[PDB]
Amino acid sequence: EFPVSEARVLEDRPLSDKGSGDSSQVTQVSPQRIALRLRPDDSKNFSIQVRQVEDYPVDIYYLMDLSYSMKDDLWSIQNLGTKLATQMRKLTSNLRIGFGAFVDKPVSPYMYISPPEALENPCYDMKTTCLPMFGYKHVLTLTDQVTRFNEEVKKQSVSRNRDAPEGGFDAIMQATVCDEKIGWRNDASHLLVFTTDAKTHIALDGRLAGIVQPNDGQCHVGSDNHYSASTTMDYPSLGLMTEKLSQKNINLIFAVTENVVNLYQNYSELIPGTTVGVLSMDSSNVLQLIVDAYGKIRSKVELEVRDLPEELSLSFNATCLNNEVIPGLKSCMGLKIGDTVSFSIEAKVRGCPQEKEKSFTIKPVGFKDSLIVQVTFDCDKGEMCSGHGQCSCGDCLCDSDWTGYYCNCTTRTDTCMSSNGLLCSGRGKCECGSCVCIQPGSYGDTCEKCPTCPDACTFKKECVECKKFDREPYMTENTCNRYCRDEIESVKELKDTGKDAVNCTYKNEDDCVVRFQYYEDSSGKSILYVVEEPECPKG
């Protein structure tokens, strides 16, 4: 009477924070491979766990804008060999670094069109002898020797062209699809830092140059380590980058100068999973964004389906914080490297189609590890079921990503996400792609607005009484970590200067008046300063 199975055909098990797989073959997704068999119009719920394994190896490819404007931001780029290594050592045992540089399409409008034929060696109509422009050159493959890196990186100098925008998206692309040349280890955490001075050429810009052929997302970087199709093919679009960026499991970091930050921030909102890091003090590198970035990059776990047959729809429930279980979601944020999570998928056909393997993956973005699922199916004038809106017949059979009787409800939760990335500003639930605020006196599209909500000195208070005192509700819930990140720090009996922040005051259960201060510098850095030594009743 209908055998609908889902036998788990594979089961390596999550390695316990084992960065190095000494014959242990590191895995971060537990069910490695299940096998569905489906009755027509049937579902079978299953699960998958994913772990941000500790000491995971990292590769770091540096794409550097070597056009005449970066001139002021160089040399101390010795840092890279040294500065990446050190500040990353505390996170990995194996770190390979590599780098390449770019300028722009050595052509028609961009390039220093031969004015004096004596100028195929630029900025001579001023004099500094900056060598010819190139497009994208791969100088050093990802290796172990940081000293060998420390040097070849000092040999590099500024070239020069005429356009403010510099392309380089062309580089981001080749850096991604030329895995052989770049040496991307399919087992390590892949990073791509993009350091630039200003604007950039996007796709279509190359029509001026007379280039009308779309970027094929192919690798065109041979022996001479130069992007050959540079002059014969347009800049890549946000989509193709996005796609290739996610396929080759690579993370784009935007280490750019202040003047042009918000631009790459806005650009990152479109290549989701991309982070922006400021690179300004003097200029050659600052505060190792990489570290804080890689940290940030690995803060969330998001499941991404690949190759799913039209007929079966997948629904999710993601238990992120200690068996809390958040329905209709497939991503957990706030994670620190090492934490483990689990989502319960539930595949389901709608009248089984025709046989074949129809395998497909489900994997966390950024990782090689994936749960592959082989599917199989056991099937061997005026219809009033409607009212419209994706409602099929017999009696309403909503398509994928559509629930509800009428089929008007969505499974989408993307439109419910805030500026900070928390579902409904953490004050309401997503309901059919729309928040319905669990009203502590709030409203707004994603329940972001709440002018009558109590002073911040009430939200943070629970943190200090937890992190610095071990004794409040947030502790009493075991949720005083992923839920109360921030960054507390016992200030030296005296209160700070930055007069663009607030300073709080309260009485703990011990009847003493504790005094703190919430602050936010540049990476939006949340930082509290607790007056070491609270005023207590004397006697």
């Binding site: 005449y68 404007s69 020069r160 062209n161 005429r162 356009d163 403010a164 510099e166």
Partner: peptide, 5 residues
């Protein structure tokens, strides 16, 4: 202006 001011 351009690849400079």
């Amino acid at each position: 202006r351009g690849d400079f001011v």
